[PDB]
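Inputs:
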Amino acid sequence: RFLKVKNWETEVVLTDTLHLKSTLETGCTEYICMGSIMHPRPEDVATKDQLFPLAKEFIDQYYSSIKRFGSKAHMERLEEVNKEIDTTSTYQLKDTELIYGAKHAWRNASRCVGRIQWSKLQVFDARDCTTAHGMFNYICNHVKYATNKGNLRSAITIFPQRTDGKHDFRVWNSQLIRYAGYKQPDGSTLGDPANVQFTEICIQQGWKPPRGRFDVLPLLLQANGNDPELFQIPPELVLEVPIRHPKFEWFKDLGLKWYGLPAVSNMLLEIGGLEFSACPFSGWYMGTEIGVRDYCDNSRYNILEEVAKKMNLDMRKTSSLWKDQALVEINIAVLYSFQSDKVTIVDHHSATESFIKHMENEYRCRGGCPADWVWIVPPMSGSITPVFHQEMLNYRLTPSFEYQPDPWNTHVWK
Amino acid sequence: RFLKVKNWETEVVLTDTLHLKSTLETGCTEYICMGSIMHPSQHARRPEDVATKDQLFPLAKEFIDQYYSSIKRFGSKAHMERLEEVNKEIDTTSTYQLKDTELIYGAKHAWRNASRCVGRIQWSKLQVFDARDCTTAHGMFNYICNHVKYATNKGNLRSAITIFPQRTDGKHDFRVWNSQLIRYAGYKQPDGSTLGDPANVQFTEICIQQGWKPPRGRFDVLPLLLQANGNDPELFQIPPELVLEVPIRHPKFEWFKDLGLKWYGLPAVSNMLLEIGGLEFSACPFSGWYMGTEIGVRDYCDNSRYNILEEVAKKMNLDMRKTSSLWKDQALVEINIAVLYSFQSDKVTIVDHHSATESFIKHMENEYRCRGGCPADWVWIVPPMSGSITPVFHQEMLNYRLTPSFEYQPDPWNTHVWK
Ligand code: HEM
Ligand code: HEM
Ligand SMILES: Cc1cc(N)nc(COc2cc(CCN3CCCCC3)cc(F)c2F)c1
Ligand SMILES: Cc1cc(N)nc(COc2cc(CCN3CCCCC3)cc(F)c2F)c1
Ligand SMILES: C[C@H](O)[C@H](O)[C@H]1CNc2nc(N)[nH]c(=O)c2N1
Ligand SMILES: C[C@H](O)[C@H](O)[C@H]1CNc2nc(N)[nH]c(=O)c2N1
Ligand SMILES: [Zn+2]
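Outputs:
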């Protein structure tokens, strides 16, 4: 009936009652914890009888949020949803419900350290969209609004929900802005090695690649289950930041840059049992996402050895900590570069601090805050951020952002 | 059914069947995960005090069965007699006694099963000091000193455990009251601040309240507070020649040595409970050698520990106005370089987090290859700095609770009735 979490740095103890409202699996069992597993069918669309309680729980939740639970408006809405689920095997969210649902899917996203901002989310209703060109128009507008000349604003564009599973809208891109990766005959990789497969798909589909190190990939948009189509985002809408270092003159000669807008486009938004297979959302970067993961993962841009060399570090023994030392300067560079170009960014320290403040506030007013310590802790300097010392309960509330199969793994080509 | 773990850096998938042998709850359910909770579960294997026969024997049968299975017996004459020997023993003493071999097996396998330990690749290479004949705090001291001396081994550290007599009724517990054998005092200053190690302030007070004369410095090795057969604990001063200490200097910053910092060489956990076939060894100090990040990240930089980042940052001439300068991160690296360089130049065994995590991946491979799995706690295995540039960050881990094991136990001062 109650669970406690303790910060071992401050001794503060919070009491989680919200986890009683979770209803879906974590992957853990009573005797094995799967807390570090990253991911614990198209005929799988909810039956009528499956949708009824899921819609009821979400509509109940929504009217409780606006302090209208039990109200005549609550009861009629509840009756109105059941009518559509009966007549049409599905139902349609009102705009208020869509906005509440999208905001609460972010709020419920246990892996996201940025949720102190959840209620500040621009929701673009794109459920009238019917074609890939239309999705392109919507996404360009998303990108322009969110980028806001460097003063980033978080935003989500919601395309039509799933119907039979055979007419899904999908952004085939995993993020809206990503650099291409190209494998060379000699086995080396040009660009972002994470996107080699997606770059091949685009190339095959008709895209003519510049074959450079920072080619923004084209959108690959699927509307209504049709074949996906290519669109080049207009380059004046892709805000980019050249990476220089405040102290090392040579750093700019690495020729590094990154894009300013992090925009996840491969995830599924589930509101009231409705599934929105195409719902790109964006915010602004934490420095480590670029500085530690994008640049320093061995499977990614892999510049640690490049950087440590320019730093004249001893790289024969790990215990010199050359990797660690070089990782810090890259992450300084990334933050300095964004900040100098007045492009919104947040360092892992400010971000984790904000999240602790946000978590404590969510325990006060909501009864808890599901959190994935494996994801919340930044990928460098973990214990010197306050979330490291923070105990966290992980559970799945709905509305939620979910993962879904890659479109090419399931699409049936026309 | 049969669970898979993947390593996202290498795409290696391992298949875990060992988890089927798990005994105790993790704290998790299908609906809530507790993987970041430090003490998620109070599920023990036996009740409060001295157990009935139906409580202790099935645990004993299980461990004996496991140990005789381990050595290609099971059902052999020795195994069946051992079952009867243990049964009669519980019948007549409400407990039983481990053979020396079963004791060594159990201590090694508790370390092998320690889901939070990144250093388990050495698990089978553990020196077990049977001290089950001990009877007094003076005895406990003798044993602990021999442990420290053997384990320290003039810098070439060696893994050891020293196993004092098991719990009987709960009144006559043996306990090392120190959480680790070698820790620095912590002193509550008049002006609100803290000198020394702030984590140890309370234990330091117990020691002073027990008659210890504090030198009142920043690196005052604490005395031992040893409790034998439930009696009042007794202070003992570890002879300093036995406490190997490394002065921290830096290979480039010559000003670093002037920070006046040192650490001890021997990490030696002395407050855990070793659990084997229902038997509880409330005093089982175990030691190995440090991962550098334990001293330089956690012991030195945690806000409620030595907290030397501002000092080292200031000396480095760092923008400390905002977080985005990453001044903490820069100092943190230099500090851990200093720790590693000092231990290596004094030829005191130490491992860096790159080497240690690389080894643990190798250990995982081995364990899945021959044991069908390896329980690991990602939250504890991933080092506290530079997580993602180490192999374990990218390695899915299954956590489950295997016996024999080390367990946490209450701090004896919360429980002990003085006399
Ligand atoms: C506004 C600033 C934001 C910041 C600084 C931020 C920060 C982060 C970071 C660092 C991660 C881990 C990313 C990774 O390691 O791949 C993450 C994950 C995530 N964020 Fe946020 N985020 C922000 C906004 C948002 C928004 C606007 C949404 C949705 C409306 C959102 C939903 C999520 C989700 C669902 C995840 C988990 C992804 C997964 O499960 O794989 N975030 N965030
Ligand atoms: C030989 C070198 C060893 C290394 C490098 C090593 C490394 C580590 C580290 C870094 C931790 C986490 C430390 C912390 O943040 O508190 C840990 C935990 C642990 N280790 Fe090992 N260890 C070693 C030896 C041993 C031995 C010999 C044993 C038992 C005989 C052992 C049993 C454990 C246990 C039970 C934990 C969990 C502690 C807790 O829950 O608080 N380790 N180890
Ligand atoms: C809204 C939002 C804000 C933020 N600050 N961050 C995110 C997550 O953003 C990205 C994450 C990645 C890598 C995704 N990662 C790959 C390995 C497997 C796990 C997922 C690439 C990108 F382009 C991203 F924008 C989302
Ligand atoms: C055998 C062994 C080897 C090794 N390499 N490391 C360890 C861990 O030993 C220590 C651990 C701590 C901190 C314990 N921690 C405090 C915060 C709350 C959680 C528990 C302090 C020390 F002095 C230690 F020696 C043990
Ligand atoms: C909240 C969290 O469980 C706590 O701070 C943990 C995190 N991981 C850890 N990992 C190790 N190795 N040692 C620790 O003390 C901790 N502390
Ligand atoms: C296996 C492990 O869960 C995996 O490497 C996780 C660890 N934590 C992470 N945390 C974040 N923020 N992003 C990630 O991609 C990962 N990867
Ligand atoms: Zn779990």
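Remarks. Residues A 28, 33-35; B 28, 33-35 surround zinc ion (ligand 7) (CB under 6 Å). Residues 327-345 of chain B form the longest helix (19 residues).
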